Amino acid sequence: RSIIDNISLANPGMSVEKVIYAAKLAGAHDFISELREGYNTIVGEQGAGL
Amino acid sequence: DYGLYALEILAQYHNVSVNPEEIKHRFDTDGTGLGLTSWLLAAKSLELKVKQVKKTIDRLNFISLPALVWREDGRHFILTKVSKEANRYLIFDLEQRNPRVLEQSEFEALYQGHIILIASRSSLAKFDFTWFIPAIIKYRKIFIETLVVSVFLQLFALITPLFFQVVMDKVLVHRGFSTLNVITVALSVVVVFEIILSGLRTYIFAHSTSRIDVELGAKLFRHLLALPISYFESRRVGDTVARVRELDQIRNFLTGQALTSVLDLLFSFIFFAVMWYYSPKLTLVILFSLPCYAAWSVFISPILRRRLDDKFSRNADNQSFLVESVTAINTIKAMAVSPQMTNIWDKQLAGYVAAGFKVTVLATIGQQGIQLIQKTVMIINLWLGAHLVISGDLSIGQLIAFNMLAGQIVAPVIRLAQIWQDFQQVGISVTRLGDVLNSPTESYHGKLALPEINGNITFRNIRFRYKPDSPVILDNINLSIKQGEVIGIVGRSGSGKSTLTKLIQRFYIPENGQVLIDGHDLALADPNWLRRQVGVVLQDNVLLNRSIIDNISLANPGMSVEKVIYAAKLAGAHDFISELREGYNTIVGEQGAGLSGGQRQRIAIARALVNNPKILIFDQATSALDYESEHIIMRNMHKICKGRTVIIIAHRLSTVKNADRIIVMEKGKIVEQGKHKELLSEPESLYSYLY
Amino acid sequence: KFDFTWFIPAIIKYRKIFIETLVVSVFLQLFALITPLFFQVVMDKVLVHRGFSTLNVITVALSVVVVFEIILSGLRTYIFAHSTSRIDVELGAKLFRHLLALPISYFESRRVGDTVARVRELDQIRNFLTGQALTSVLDLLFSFIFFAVMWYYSPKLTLVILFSLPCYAAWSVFISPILRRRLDDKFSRNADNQSFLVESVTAINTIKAMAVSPQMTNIWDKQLAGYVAAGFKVTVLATIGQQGIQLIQKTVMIINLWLGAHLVISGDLSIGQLIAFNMLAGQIVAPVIRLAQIWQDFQQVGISVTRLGDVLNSPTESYHGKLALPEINGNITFRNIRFRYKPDSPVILDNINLSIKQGEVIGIVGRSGSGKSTLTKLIQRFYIPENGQVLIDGHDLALADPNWLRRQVGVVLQDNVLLNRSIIDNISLANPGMSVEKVIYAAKLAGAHDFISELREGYNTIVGEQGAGLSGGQRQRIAIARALVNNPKILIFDQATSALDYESEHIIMRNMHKICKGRTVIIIAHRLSTVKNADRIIVMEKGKIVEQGKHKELLSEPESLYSYLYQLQS
Amino acid sequence: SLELKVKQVKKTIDRLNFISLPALVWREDGRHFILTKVSKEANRYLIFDLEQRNPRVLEQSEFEALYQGHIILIASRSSLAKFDFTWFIPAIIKYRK
Amino acid sequence: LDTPVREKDENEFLPAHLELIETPVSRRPRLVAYFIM
Amino acid sequence: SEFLLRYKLVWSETWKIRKQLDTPVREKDENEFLPAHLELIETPVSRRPRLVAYFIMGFLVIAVILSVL
Ligand SMILES: Nc1ncnc2c1ncn2[C@@H]1O[C@H](COP(=O)(O)OP(=O)(O)OP(=O)(O)O)[C@@H](O)[C@H]1O
Ligand SMILES: Nc1ncnc2c1ncn2[C@@H]1O[C@H](COP(=O)(O)OP(=O)(O)OP(=O)(O)O)[C@@H](O)[C@H]1O
Ligand SMILES: [Mg+2]
Ligand SMILES: [Mg+2]
Cβ neighbourhood burial of C105 (10 Å; 0-12, 13-18, 19+) = middle
Q: Do residues C412 and C492 touch, judged by C-beta distance below 8 A?
A: yes
In chain B, which segments carry CATH 1.20.1560.10? Answer: 129-438
Encode C391-419: b = buried (16+ Cβ within 10 Å), e = exposed: bbbebebeebbbbbbbbbbbbbbbbbbbb
What does each C-alpha distance from B53 to A30, B34, B50, B59, B118 come to in angstroms?
Answer: 49, 19, 10, 12, 11
SS3 C336: strand
Name the residue at shortest CA distance from atom 25 of ligand 2. C368
Reduced to 3 DSSP states, what percent helix, strand and coil does chain C have, rounded to the nearest 5? 65, 10, 30
DSSP string, B183-199: HHHHHHHHHHHHHHHHH
CA atoms of B322 and B345, how far apart (whole Å): 8
Residue B279: count of CB within 10 angstroms of its CB: 17
| Ramachandran category for residue C452: left, alpha or beta (phi over 0 → left; psi -120 to 50 → alpha) | alpha
Q: Do residues C390 and C334 touch, judged by C-beta distance below 8 A?
A: yes
Nearest-CA residue of chain B relative to D76?
Answer: B347
What does each C-alpha distance from C364 to B430, C498, C503, C529, C544 come to in angstroms?
Answer: 55, 15, 22, 12, 12
CA atoms of C524 and B306, how far apart (whole Å): 54
Using only C-alpha atoms, chain B has a radius of gyration, in whole angstroms, of 35
Q: Using a CB–CB cutoff of 8 Å, tell me whether F48 touches chain C.
A: no
List C residues 232-251 in contact with B (Cβ-Cβ < 8 A).
232, 235-236, 239-240, 243, 246-247, 250-251
D16 Cα to chain F: minimum distance (Å): 10
Name the residue at shortest CA distance from atom 9 of ligand 1. C470
Contact criterion met (CB < 8 Å) for B519 and A39 = no
Sign of CA dihedral B207, B209, B210, B211: positive
Half-sphere exposure (Cβ direction) of B244: Cα atoms closer than 13 Å: 29
Q: Do residues E11 and B189 touch, judged by C-beta distance below 8 A?
A: no
Which residues 6+ apart lie within 8 Å of B470 measured at CB? C456
Q: Do residues B687 and B679 touch, judged by C-beta distance below 8 A?
A: yes
Between B and C, how many residue pairs show a Cβ–Cβ distance under 8 A? 390
Residues in chain E: 37
Is it true that the peptide bond before B161 is cis, omega within 30 degrees of 0? no
SS3 F15: helix
Q: Which amino acid is at C77?
A: T
Q: Do residues B388 and B279 touch, judged by C-beta distance below 8 A?
A: yes
CA atoms of C347 and C332, how far apart (whole Å): 22
Contact criterion met (CB < 8 Å) for B514 and A37 = no
**For every residue of B382-435, which 3-state class applies, written as one string?**
HHHHHHHHHHCCCCHHHHHHHHHHHHHHHHHHHHHHHCHHHHHHHHHHHHHHHH
C464 annotated as belonging to a binding site for a ligand: no
Known binding residues of B for ATP are 491-498
Least CB–CB distance from C230: residue in E1, E2, E5: E5
Q: Which long-range contacts (CB under 8 A, 24 or more apart) does D57-64 make?
A: D64/D13
CA atoms of D84 and D89, how far apart (whole Å): 10
Which residues are paired to B365 by β-bridges?
A: none
Give me the helices (H) in C331-467, please: 372-379, 402-408, 423-427, 436-445, 449-454
Half-sphere exposure (Cβ direction) of D10: Cα atoms closer than 13 Å: 3
Q: Which residues of C touch E4 (CB under 8 A)?
A: 181-182, 185
Name the residue at shortest CA distance from atom 16 of ligand 2. C371
Residues with CB in 5 Å of ion ligand 4: B 596-597; C 373, 414
Closest C-alpha among C168, C171, C136, C123 to residue C300: C123
SS3 B572: coil
Q: Do residues C180 and C302 touch, judged by C-beta distance below 8 A?
A: yes
- Ligand with the closest atom to the CA of C105: 2
CA atoms of C338 and C336, how far apart (whole Å): 6
Strand B534-537: give its sheet, edge to edge. B534-537, B615-619, B645-649, B487-491, B661-666, B669-672
DSSP string, C139-171: HHHGGGHHHHHHHHH-HHHHHHHHHHHHHHHHH
Contact criterion met (CB < 8 Å) for C221 and E4 = no
Closest C-alpha among C195, C187, C189 to residue C302: C187
Q: Do residues F4 and D48 touch, judged by C-beta distance below 8 A?
A: no
Least CB–CB distance from E14: residue in C181, C221, C232: C221
Mutate to test the interface with A, among B9, B10, B15 (most CBs of A within 10 A): B15
Strands C362-366 and C520-524: parallel
Strands B67-69 and C409-412: unpaired
Contact criterion met (CB < 8 Å) for B521 and A33 = no
B609 secondary structure, DSSP code:
H
Homologous superfamily (CATH) for C4-313? ABC transporter type 1, transmembrane domain (1.20.1560.10)
| Ramachandran category for residue C415: left, alpha or beta (phi over 0 → left; psi -120 to 50 → alpha) | beta
CA atoms of C142 and C158, how far apart (whole Å): 17
CA atoms of C399 and C320, how far apart (whole Å): 6
CA atoms of B617 and B500, how far apart (whole Å): 10
In chain C, which segments carry CATH 3.40.50.300? Answer: 332-565
Nearest atom in ligand 2 to the alpha carbon of residue B624 is 27
Q: Do residues B321 and B345 touch, judged by C-beta distance below 8 A?
A: yes
Chain CA centroid to CA C403, Å: 20
H/E run at residue C513: helix C502-515
Q: Do residues E20 and B35 touch, judged by C-beta distance below 8 A?
A: no
Q: Do residues B218 and C221 touch, judged by C-beta distance below 8 A?
A: yes
B234 secondary structure, DSSP code:
H
CA atoms of B63 and B6, how far apart (whole Å): 18
- Ligand with the closest atom to the CA of C377: 2
Q: Which amino acid is at B140?
A: R
CA atoms of B585 and B393, how far apart (whole Å): 85
Q: Using a CB–CB cutoff of 8 Å, tell me whether E7 touches chain B.
A: no
CA atoms of C33 and C160, how far apart (whole Å): 20
Closest C-alpha among C558, C559, C566 to residue C526: C566
Mutate to test the interface with B, among A16, A37, A39, A42 (most CBs of B within 10 A): A37
C368 lines ligand 2 (CB under 6 A): yes
End-to-end CA distance of chain D: 25
Encode B352-390: b = buried (16+ Cβ within 10 Å), e = exposed: bbbbbbebbbbbbebbbbbbbbbbbbbbebbbbbbebbb
Sign of CA dihedral B181, B183, B185, B186: positive
For chain E, breaks with the C atom over 2.5 A from the next N come after: none
Mutate to test the interface with F, among C31, C79, C126 (most CBs of F within 10 A): C79
Chain CA centroid to CA B212, Å: 13
CA atoms of C333 and C335, how far apart (whole Å): 7
D71 secondary structure, DSSP code:
E
What does each C-alpha distance from B425 to C73, C119, C235 come to in angstroms?
Answer: 24, 20, 20
Cβ neighbourhood burial of B529 (10 Å; 0-12, 13-18, 19+) = buried
Q: Using a CB–CB cutoff of 8 Å, tell me whether F42 touches chain D.
A: no
B638 secondary structure, DSSP code:
H
Q: Do residues B668 and B499 touch, judged by C-beta distance below 8 A?
A: yes
What does each C-alpha distance from C34 to B556, C76, E7 come to in angstroms?
Answer: 74, 18, 56
End-to-end CA distance of chain E: 27
Q: Do residues C489 and C408 touch, judged by C-beta distance below 8 A?
A: yes
Q: Do residues B247 and B134 touch, judged by C-beta distance below 8 A?
A: no
Q: Using a CB–CB cutoff of 8 Å, tell me whether E11 touches chain B.
A: no
What's the C452 CA to ligand 1 centre distance in angstroms?
Answer: 12
Q: Using a CB–CB cutoff of 8 Å, tell me whether C106 touches chain B.
A: no
Q: Which residues of B touch A14 (CB under 8 A)?
A: none
Q: Do residues B115 and B67 touch, judged by C-beta distance below 8 A?
A: yes
Q: Do residues B403 and B231 touch, judged by C-beta distance below 8 A?
A: no
CA atoms of B274 and D7, how far apart (whole Å): 64
Least CB–CB distance from E35: residue in B196, B210, B214: B196
H/E run at residue C521: strand C520-524
CA atoms of B67 and B53, how far apart (whole Å): 11
CA atoms of E18 and E21, how far apart (whole Å): 5
Strands C490-494 and C409-412: parallel
CA atoms of B342 and C96, how far apart (whole Å): 7
Contact criterion met (CB < 8 Å) for C229 and E13 = yes
Give me the helices (H) in D1-97, please: 60-65, 88-94
Q: Using a CB–CB cutoff of 8 Å, tell me whether B447 touches chain A.
A: yes
Residues in chain A: 50
For domain C332-565, is the CATH number 3.40.50.300?
Answer: yes
Provide the greatest CA pair distance for chain F. Answer: 53
E7 Cα to chain B: minimum distance (Å): 16
**For every residue of B48-77, which 3-state class applies, written as one string?**
CEEEEEECCCCHHHCCCCCEEECCCCCCCE
What does each C-alpha distance from B266 to B156, B157, B191, B207, E17 come to in angstroms?
Answer: 16, 15, 22, 22, 33
Rounded-to-10 torsion of CA B375, B380, B386, B388: -130
Into which CATH architecture does domain B457-690 fall? Answer: 3-Layer(aba) Sandwich (3.40)
Pick the CATH number of B2-119 from 3.40.640.10, 3.90.70.10, 3.40.50.620, 3.40.50.720: 3.90.70.10
Q: Which residues of C touch F41 (CB under 8 A)?
A: 86, 89-90
Which residues 6+ apart lie within 8 Å of F57 measured at CB? C23, C24, C27
Half-sphere exposure (Cβ direction) of B60: Cα atoms closer than 13 Å: 29
Using only C-alpha atoms, chain A has a radius of gyration, in whole angstroms, of 11
Q: Using a CB–CB cutoff of 8 Å, tell me whether F37 touches chain B.
A: yes
Which residues 6+ apart lie within 8 Å of C67 measured at CB? B372, B375
Contact criterion met (CB < 8 Å) for F39 and B353 = no
Closest C-alpha among C237, C368, B428, A1 to residue E5: C237
**For every residue of B432-457, which 3-state class applies, written as one string?**
HHHHHHCCCCCCCCCCCCCCCCCCCE
Chain CA centroid to CA B299, Å: 36
Angle (nearest 5°) at CA C334 between C330 and C336: 175
B64 lines ligand 1 (CB under 6 A): no
Q: Do residues B673 and B661 touch, judged by C-beta distance below 8 A?
A: yes
Q: Do residues C367 and C328 touch, judged by C-beta distance below 8 A?
A: no
Return the best residue to mutate from B542, B580, B595 for the ligand 2 pocket (most ligand atoms within 8 A of CB): B595
SS3 B503: helix
Q: Do residues F53 and C24 touch, judged by C-beta distance below 8 A?
A: yes
Q: Which residues of C touch E18 (CB under 8 A)?
A: none
SS3 C331: coil
CA atoms of B311 and B348, how far apart (whole Å): 11
Which residues 6+ apart lie within 8 Å of B606 measured at CB? B552, B564, B567, B568, B570, B571, B573
Out of D19, D32, D48, D66, the active site residue is: D32
Which residues are paired to E15 by β-bridges?
A: none
Nearest-CA residue of chain F relative to D7?
Answer: F29
Is it true that the peptide bond before F44 is cis, omega within 30 degrees of 0? no
Task: Kindly provide the resolution of this structure in angstroms, with one decimal.
Answer: 3.4
Q: Do residues C276 and C153 touch, judged by C-beta distance below 8 A?
A: yes
Which residues 6+ apart lie within 8 Å of E2 measured at CB? C178, C181
CA atoms of C251 and B461, how far apart (whole Å): 83
Strands C349-352 and C362-366: unpaired
Closest C-alpha among B20, B50, B19 to residue B37: B50
Closest C-alpha among B22, C79, B561, B509 to residue F43: C79
B594 lines ligand 2 (CB under 6 A): yes
Is B76 catalytic? The answer is yes
D86 secondary structure, DSSP code:
G
DSSP string, C238-297: HHHHHHHHHHHHHHHHHHHHHHHHHHHHHSS--HHHHHHHHHHHHHHHHHHHHHHTTHHH
CA atoms of C497 and C516, how far apart (whole Å): 16
B651 Cα to chain C: minimum distance (Å): 5
Q: Do residues C384 and C320 touch, judged by C-beta distance below 8 A?
A: no
Residue B344: count of CB within 10 angstroms of its CB: 13
C450 lines ligand 1 (CB under 6 A): no
Into which CATH architecture does domain B129-438 fall? Answer: Up-down Bundle (1.20)
List B residues 288-317 in contact with C (Cβ-Cβ < 8 A).
315
In chain C, which segments carry CATH 1.20.1560.10? Answer: 4-313
C376 lines ligand 2 (CB under 6 A): no
What does each C-alpha distance from B618 to B452, B575, B608, D69 come to in angstroms?
Answer: 21, 22, 9, 71
CA atoms of C253 and C234, how far apart (whole Å): 28
Chain CA centroid to CA B604, Å: 26
Least CB–CB distance from F33: residue in D15, D19, D79: D19
CATH topology of domain D1-75: Cathepsin B; Chain A (3.90.70)
Residue C221: count of CB within 10 angstroms of its CB: 20
